[PDB]
Amino acid sequence: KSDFKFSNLLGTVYRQGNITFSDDGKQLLSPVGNRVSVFDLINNKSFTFEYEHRKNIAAIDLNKQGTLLISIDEDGRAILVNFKARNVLHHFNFKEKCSAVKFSPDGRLFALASGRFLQIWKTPDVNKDRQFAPFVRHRVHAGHFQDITSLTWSQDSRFILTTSKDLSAKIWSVDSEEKNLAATTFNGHRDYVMGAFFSHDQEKIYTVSKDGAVFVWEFTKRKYSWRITKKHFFYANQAKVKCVTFHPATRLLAVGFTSGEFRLYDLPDFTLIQQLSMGQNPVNTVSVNQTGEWLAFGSSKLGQLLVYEWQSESYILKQQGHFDSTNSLAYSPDGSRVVTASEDGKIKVWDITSGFCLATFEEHTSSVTAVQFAKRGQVMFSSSLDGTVRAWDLIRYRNFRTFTGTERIQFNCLAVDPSGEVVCAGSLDNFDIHVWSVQTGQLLDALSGHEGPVSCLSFSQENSVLASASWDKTIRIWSIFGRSQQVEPIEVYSDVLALSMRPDGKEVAVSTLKGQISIFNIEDAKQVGNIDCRKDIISGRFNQDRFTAKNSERSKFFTTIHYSFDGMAIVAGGNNNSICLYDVPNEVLLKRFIVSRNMALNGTLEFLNSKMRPEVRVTSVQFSPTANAFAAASTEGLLIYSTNDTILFDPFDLDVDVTPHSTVEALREKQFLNALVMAFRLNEEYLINKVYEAIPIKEIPLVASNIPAIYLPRILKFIGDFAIESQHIEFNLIWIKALLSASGGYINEHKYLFSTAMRSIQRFIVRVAKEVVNTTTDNKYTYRFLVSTDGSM
């Protein structure tokens, strides 16, 4: 239950730093703020590393074995991570701002540009155990006079070519015996040298500067001593070079400027292969694939990330995120994608597994305040500060409906019908609730009776009663449908922000400004029970303010709460860097999550070092409708916290004779039901999978009819989280058919137990199985046409 771990970070495909590819360039590693995201672009998936720098990261490299990563932040706190185990190996503090870090091509050394010293360390093994000091220093060279801007290793890991703000570039041999081969310095640029590369044969050296000159250096005679043979110029007048890279094998120089324009050249002849623009913001990063076919560009101001193949002129992806400006989120009615309403005025529909945005919608001319799904993922409603609620078909991607009032107000929250006839929206300057029909477009009603700004709205999903709650310290329940026009006001102790509604519509949980979460019975309007949450809230100290984090009244309350789908838990977040979840029977804190440890954000540290910034805040929390997770719209992105059953041995009434050995003996002796319930009492995912695949098709329905009723949600949620990605489609559908036929009355009379295990199953039937069935159906009908009709002339 409560054992959530940080899974993913949706939104924000790039923040600051350098993009890296893999060696077999399938994944790309992107520095999001202090995490690192890794997007696998072929196997369409994505993860974010769990570890966390304390400032924004500025350098990334992983060796070409793929086996370990090193990430340096913007004051030199390096972190060495095991890339396969996903666990951090060492924390090493270089003392000043490191501009670049690079592993050697042979993997065994890495070097980095810390200030004006090039320092080469040698890589610790991944097979060795963790030591107190795993890095052993090779050397530290100081020949530059100002800060080094770039490294480049040679093809053999033998020379290293560094570029500085000082107007030179230098070549250093790795070992001392080749010191005479590499002792030259390369002058002649008017500005900062942005890059210095070898050719494929390491005979020519190209040095690209900030003003726009690329110099070709050759070991010629005018003795032989590294002349400059040709200077080529970009002649981009106002713009200047922001990032350079070179693929030496395909002779491809890729250059991004401070105007969004990037050009890519075939270098020793200097012929413009292509020139095109990311946008208007500067191109902060260029990176290239190992085969040189993909170019990943990152612009840091809008947080955007291209990877673009330059042969077939086409963008593998275009993915722009939102730093700090995200007002709301909503899970799709199957937990496959999250819709994000963001303050720059747009809707963005992010896939969860593959961490990318599918569609974006810009028809609001101001900050979109709320999104909400309806009609089972077919329609999606959003309300913004420009005065409009509007509806979005997620099939034809059209804004088909726009609802305004008559009073020119700005809407801050909405709520739709279950049977989506009516949308409803509340403002923070009008004290009314606006009730629109969705079929026609008209303003059906204006509900009046709050004496304070309507902070939150929610329709009960079962009996369709409206619950609004406002800053006049009052939650209010409106019976709209069918001749009632009934109003029931429940007073509460302080002013309310974030009401939420149970999945059965029985109760409503409100968050108040005191710091509490009160839970009320709707039909008999009396309080069922409250949680006192203002003492398990982490409220950090800002830098500008002159009052301690203990005595602050800034963020000791929750501005967004949400029920779990079994109705038993509440996740909650606010303008603080803790999100807390509770179980509402016992009113006790299950777990508290620190949403950021970035010291670049403001409200993170409670105690500031006695030796504006974007504050940290969560603006919306939601539980996943299909699989045991929650998304939180922080300032860093959409933090996705999820459990997984691979770890955490948590049995269910095992005894001493219940053992993996006992389970495989019962499987080998083919008591299949006993093996299945032994694996359920182990609650071990590999054992459940092993027994599940070992049961034959002949006796799926006998086992599925004899499964005990306490192990029913376990086998249903297992079949869901297995069958989304497993290939055994007919096996999983046979099991689903046998379970629904044998015990599908228990499910119907215990709806909210199997409310997230059944939504995960019909995330498998309509999303892989129905697509396959559509393909075979179209093949059958094209066959019947192509052989049944007359093609003659």
Partner: protein
């Protein structure tokens, strides 16, 4: 100099101010004891903030209530509201928060009108 706490209990036009502080255990309404609060059939309406949580909460604190306005039943409802939320506020400020919200849970399970009145009315249908 003493840890003290002041709360208010209201029904229609009665209003009761309750001062709770640390002491020996005496509960006094309008100077007279609590066992004199007429109309004597609603003396248990006055008593139920004591009997719902036990007298061992009141064994270390002394309450005094001053009740003006209203009528007989509005004054006993003001008294019981003032006593209840005064005990809650004292255990908030000077005893632990766990006993604070245990008291809030007990009073709210009996009736939350011990703690929150029904105040602004009517409804214009």
């Amino acid at each position: 100099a003493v840890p003290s706490v002041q709360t208010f209990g209201k029904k229609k036009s009665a209003t009761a101010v309750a001062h709770v502080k640390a002491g020996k255990g005496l509960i006094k309404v309008n100077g007279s004891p609590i066992t004199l609060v007429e109309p004597e059939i609603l003396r248990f309406k006055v008593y139920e903030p004591l009997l719902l949580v036990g007298l061992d909460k009141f064994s270390n604190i002394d309450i005094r209530v001053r009740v003006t306005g209203g009528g007989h039943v509005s004054q006993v409802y003001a008294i019981r509201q003032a006593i209840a939320k005064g005990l809650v506020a004292y255990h908030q400020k000077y005893v632990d928060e766990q006993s604070k919200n245990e008291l809030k849970k007990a009073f709210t399970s009996y009736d939350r009108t011990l703690l929150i009145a029904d105040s602004r009315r009517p409804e214009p249908k």
